[PDB]
Amino acid sequence: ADLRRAVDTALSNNRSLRQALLDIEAARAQYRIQRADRLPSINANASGNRQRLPADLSQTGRSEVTSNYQVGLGLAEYEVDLFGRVRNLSEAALETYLATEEATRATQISLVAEVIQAYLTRDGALRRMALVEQTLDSRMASLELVSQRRAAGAATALDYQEAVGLAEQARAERESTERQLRQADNALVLLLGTPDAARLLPATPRDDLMVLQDIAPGTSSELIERRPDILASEHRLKARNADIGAARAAFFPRISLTGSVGSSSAELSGLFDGGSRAWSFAPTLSLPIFAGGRNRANLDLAEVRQDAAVADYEGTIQTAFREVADALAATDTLRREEAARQALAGSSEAAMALAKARYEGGVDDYLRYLDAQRSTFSNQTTLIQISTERQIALVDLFRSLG
Amino acid sequence: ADLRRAVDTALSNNRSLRQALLDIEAARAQYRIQRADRLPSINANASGNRQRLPADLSQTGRSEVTSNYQVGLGLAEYEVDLFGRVRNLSEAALETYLATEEATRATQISLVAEVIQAYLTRDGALRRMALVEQTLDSRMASLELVSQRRAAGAATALDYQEAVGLAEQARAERESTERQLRQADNALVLLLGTPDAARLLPATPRDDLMVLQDIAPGTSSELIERRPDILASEHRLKARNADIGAARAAFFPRISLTGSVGSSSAELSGLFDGGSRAWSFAPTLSLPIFAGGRNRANLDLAEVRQDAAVADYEGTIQTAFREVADALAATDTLRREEAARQALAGSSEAAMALAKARYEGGVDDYLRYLDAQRSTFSNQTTLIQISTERQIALVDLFRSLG
Amino acid sequence: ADLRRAVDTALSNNRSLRQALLDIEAARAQYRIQRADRLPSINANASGNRQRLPADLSQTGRSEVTSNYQVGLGLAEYEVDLFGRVRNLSEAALETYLATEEATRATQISLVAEVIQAYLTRDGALRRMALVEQTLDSRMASLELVSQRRAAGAATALDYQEAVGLAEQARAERESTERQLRQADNALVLLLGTPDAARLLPATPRDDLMVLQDIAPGTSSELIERRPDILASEHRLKARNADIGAARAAFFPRISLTGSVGSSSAELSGLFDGGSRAWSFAPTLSLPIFAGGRNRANLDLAEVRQDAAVADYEGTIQTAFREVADALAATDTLRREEAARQALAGSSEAAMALAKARYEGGVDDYLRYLDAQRSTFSNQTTLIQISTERQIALVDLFRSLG
């Protein structure tokens, strides 16, 4: 239940997710840039040229000095287009924007998966912490008992030394578990993206279900149709298929329309006088007759780039298939391994019960009961690593399934 | 023997290899693009300009409207070149294409080596599987015997619990080995690039030699001249050296010949009438007298980029040296370690013979024979990891040597 | 003491550091490129246009052939800038150069820390080598003693086999540690960047202090103000803020002054005769009245890019915070773990002393003394891995603190 709140908080506040959502807007703006090219551009132009072959003659100087002044609206090289290369560029930009949106969705799912993995690791670490703490308590109890026994002369110094060594060995394990727990907490605080993240997480471990234990993978086609990474690859392939059309349109003639409307005069004073309203119109037709490879090798570049995009799409499909196969195998194998470790923990607990019953009857010493404690507790914490790994494998399955 | 067939199949069908081979064609097409620039560009141009200072007057309107219409062939800004900057760009593109070819060769080698490594991992996993299966059988035999002994009262419940725990521990090892084997199979099917890869692999392990056990590394100079990544780095350095000449030629004057031949008239009706065949020739000589840093800082950019290219060449050489030295050290050390594990396995088998002889004589119980079975088999599988690591190290040495 | 010398040698000779220092010069050159745009550009221009409406007429042909030949100086489209978009791009290039300098500093620190870590790993490996060598010696002593005992019939063949197995196991550990030591030496020779690196290191490990043991992290704001990668991120954000100004200035009108001074004549012979000194001056005003999204969506692109840069800055801050937290936790935890392992080593040494005292008195056999040797030595080296990891964690803390 806390996972949904964590996911909502990440969606609200995560920084890389904000980066991806803004990249969506960036791709949208670039698509708008390319789409705006499809409409004619009109520009207000004010120009004045002053030229003469003799020298000096400035500010109404004494010569044949020519001056022209053109102010008005102008249609600047409107490409009237038989194929719509601009349209193909707009299509490529739109496909790029769609791919960016799909990549943002994939980043969102990846962030969710990372967060839940960190949470599961933290829970396992908390369980391990309680486990090793009580284990160290058991070790210290055994050390105290052995020290008291040698003080009475019933034990050699070798036994005291071995007890000390066992206690120190357990202490190192406790330190390692502390380091693991602190690193997990730091990873969670990094993932959540807020300085108050440590306040939003529960402080103690819980035995409740966190994520669904059994997931049906369905068919490979369903994985293909739902995973955002494959969708981004397909959209990128489509953008490349637009680029091939652009390079193909590069071959055909383009018609360009240059026009103007405004005023013209040889002197500034007559710039706004009656009868100065002028205009112009031109339709030029551009077609390199012989590319010499200049436009042909552009076609081969486009074709080869589209081929590389197709191969990238196939490779991403193969990577997705590998990921889902690995995740399914891990899920099944870790489920069975967790069953095995659960059986081991139950056997150790039964051994504890028998040792406790023997000791309370005065037949076995305190050392046997304490050692049973240590053994069953070590097995119970060893179960926890397998359980946490199974949960992380389930999360990896969920991610790799899209 | 199967390895050569796998290599041929990968060359025929691998997707990243197809990407690299297509990138070869892309670099070739780009080289053709840049080489086409060295030849004159002649384009067919048709233009019509209609302009006048008063307004209205459309479609032969009543004024001094000037209309000109020019249709013909035109040499569009042929840069006749005193230094051949275009030639330097063509050389840079050719060097880039050569570097792309070398990178494709390196990708081929990498894919091949990954294939052998995954295959060897699968073989080792199969051996480990047979091992742990029979080990688990041994554990069940011991558990059954201990259960039968407690049923008769000759064994305590503690012994039954320890037998159960050992059997459960062995089950976990079997599950881990199953996960490893399945992951190796998935890796192989990913690498081979075919859904029927699981049919192209033999289902059982073999003791036959797969790759040459003793390889002479030769000298480091031979490694430099044969490893494709160093060659790709050298070709990239050469392309940088060509871009140096490009930026250097950016300083010198360029001569640009614009030309045209076609028709021109004040009215459209006379466009194809006699006496309108016009021509034009215009050479321009371009040389910024004072760059102000505009052409100079380009020169510094080129020189500094060349220095960085030399540095990357040296770094790649150092990385290759590190890789080959590590591979040699690993080969020798894992050879000696495998010898050690072979000795351990032989000692365990001798203990097998002795324990079996003792048990068949009725001196030792079935537990001793079964425990010895477990021990010798655990040693035999522990040898297998070292052997597989040595084989993978040999494959890595092959990859590193080109 | 040797560490500062190693750092100095790396600064003098490292290749990636040379790459970064040269990238500083490259960024400086690009900044000079973009800054030189702020000044007017003058270019020597010589052109000759020969055109006429009929055909033939080459080399003073018989027609109305028009020839003009202009040689002189020309101010080519010098942009008079209302907003200084040129200034904004120069500022963006300057910020990029500053970011490159900071990134070079960060690369310097990273290379230093890598060198220190490799050196510490080599020291630990040397200690482990002496350790495992004497441990193997102990194993062979035990094997010889057990073989001599079986020759006399006082020991079974099973005991000889277990002794052989233990000796072979120890040999494998020796081989593994040899591989580790050789790989560490290879890493050092790669990092130092000189073929004579193996002559600059001590052949025997030392117990002296190498790096300071206690470091105060200070406050997070201090980490924000000193770590070079955060500085590079901030500088990149500033460069993005400058490109914001460039895209904003793209909206406003641009004045463009074109000018010329030189000679002009209808025939070549009069190119340098008196009375031909011509000049030209033109100030054009360019302002698209309706962007149509062409300039607006550029503004959106710039704003969204600036937002993405801000998010990148925040994410880099979070990454640095995570790194310093991990480093502090590791420092403390490995300090306490090293204390625990030191206590274990001391206990094992005391057990050694007691076992030697017993054996010299003729109470315990040689096997017990040899086993005490093996145990105390294994524990003493098990301390060494923790010590080396603590040193490496200190180095990581130094790197992550800038």
SS (H, E, C) A168-233: HHHHHHHHHHHHHHHHHHHHHHHHHCCCCHHHCCCCCCCCCCCCCCCCCCCCHHHHHHHCHHHHHH
* Candidates C25, C39, C175; nearest CB to B340: C175
Six-digit token pair at C303?
Answer: 């704003």
Mind telling me how many Å the CA of C275 is from chain A's nearest CA? Answer: 6
CB count, 10 Å around CB of C65? 18
Cα Rg, chain A, nearest whole Å: 38
* Candidates A22, A37, A55; nearest CB to C304: A22
Q: Which residues of C touch A53 (CB under 8 A)?
A: 264, 275-278
Q: Tally C-beta pairs within 8 A across A and C.
A: 159
Which residue in C318, C341, C387, C397 has the most chain A C-beta atoms within 10 A of its own C-beta, making it the best mutation to test that interface? C318
CB count, 10 Å around CB of C259? 18
* Candidates C32, C50, C172; nearest CB to B341: C172
Q: Which amino acid is at A149?
A: R
Mind telling me how many Å the CA of A390 is from chain B's nearest CA? Answer: 12
β partners of residue A50: A67, C281
Whether A351 sits inside 8 A of B162 (CB atoms) is: yes
* Candidates C23, C47, C169; nearest CB to B282: C47
Rounded to 5°, angle at Cα B306 from B305 and B311: 95
Q: Which residues of C touch B237 (CB under 8 A)?
A: none
Q: Which residues of A touch C244 (CB under 8 A)?
A: none
* Candidates C33, C50, C54; nearest CB to B298: C33
Contacts 24+ apart (CB under 8 A), C47-52: C47/B282, C47/B283, C47/B284, C47/B285, C47/C71, C48/B282, C48/B283, C48/C268, C49/B280, C49/B281, C49/B282, C50/B280, C50/B281, C50/B282, C51/B278, C51/B279, C51/B280, C51/B281, C52/B278, C52/B279
Whether C293 sits inside 8 A of A43 (CB atoms) is: no
Count of helices and strands (H, E) across chain B: 9, 4
Q: Give the closest residue to A189 by CA, choosing from C338, C358, B321, C326.
A: C326
Whether B45 sits inside 8 A of A285 (CB atoms) is: yes
Q: List all chains that touch chain C, counting a touch as 3 or more CB pairs closer than 8 Å.
A: A, B
Under 8 Å between Cβ of B280 and C51? yes
**What kind and span of H or E run contains A45?**
strand A42-52
Whether A29 sits inside 8 A of C301 (CB atoms) is: yes
| Helix A228-249 with A296-360: angle, nearest 10 deg | 170
Closest-approach residue (CA) in chain B for C13: B311
Under 8 Å between Cβ of C332 and A197? no
Q: List all chains that touch chain A, counting a touch as 3 or more CB pairs closer than 8 Å.
A: B, C
Mind telling me how many Å the CA of B324 is from chain A's nearest CA? Answer: 30
Whether A29 sits inside 8 A of C300 (CB atoms) is: yes
Strands of C12-85, DSSP E: 42-52, 66-80
Question: What is the rounded CA–CA span in Å between residue C285 and residue C243?
Answer: 23
Q: Give the closest residue to B395 by CA, choosing from B124, B75, B156, B128.
A: B124
Whether B354 sits inside 8 A of C54 (CB atoms) is: no
Lookup result for tokens 């780039």:
A305
Q: Which amino acid is at A180?
A: Q
Whether A30 sits inside 8 A of C282 (CB atoms) is: no
Q: Give the closest residue to C53 by CA, choosing from B263, B257, B266, B46.
A: B263
Largest CA distance in chain B: 132
Mind telling me how many Å the CA of C269 is from chain A's nearest CA? Answer: 16
Question: What is the rounded CA–CA span in Å between residue C233 and residue C402?
Answer: 14
Q: Are strands C42-52 and B42-52 parallel, antiparallel or unpaired?
A: unpaired
For the CA atoms of C157, C159, C162, C167, the dihedral, rounded to the nearest 10 degrees, stands at -100
Method: cryo-EM
Question: What is the rounded CA–CA span in Å between residue C116 and residue C9?
Answer: 12
* Candidates A301, A315, A386; nearest CB to B30: A301
For residue B290, give Cα distances in angstroms to A239, B47, B246, C41.
Answer: 44, 37, 19, 8
Whether A343 sits inside 8 A of B36 (CB atoms) is: no
Distance of CA B244 to the CA centre of its chain: 29
Resolution in A, one decimal?
3.0
* Candidates B43, B169, B193; nearest CB to A344: B169
Mind telling me how many Å the CA of A358 is from chain C's nearest CA? Answer: 32
Q: Which residues of C touch B386 (CB under 8 A)?
A: 172
Closest-approach residue (CA) in chain C for B337: C172
For residue C380, give Cα distances in angstroms to A256, B65, C170, C351.
Answer: 84, 104, 16, 13
Q: Tally C-beta pairs within 8 A across A and B.
A: 151
Under 8 Å between Cβ of C323 and C228? no
Whether A277 sits inside 8 A of B55 (CB atoms) is: yes
Q: Give the closest residue to B343 by CA, choosing from B391, B380, B375.
A: B380
Q: Tally C-beta pairs within 8 A across B and C.
A: 160
Whether A51 sits inside 8 A of C307 (CB atoms) is: no
Q: Which residues of B touch A301 (CB under 8 A)?
A: 26, 29-30, 33
Q: Which residues of C touch B319 (CB under 8 A)?
A: 190
Residues 6 or more apart from B275 whose CB is under 8 A from it?
C53, C54
Under 8 Å between Cβ of C145 and B314? no
Whether B278 sits inside 8 A of C52 (CB atoms) is: yes
Backbone angles phi, psi at A240, to 5 degrees: -65, -35
Under 8 Å between Cβ of B341 and C172? yes
Question: What is the rounded CA–CA span in Å between residue C393 and residue C118?
Answer: 12
* Candidates A287, A329, A348; nearest CB to B179: A329
Whether C186 sits inside 8 A of B325 (CB atoms) is: yes
Q: List all chains that touch chain B, counting a touch as 3 or more CB pairs closer than 8 Å.
A: A, C
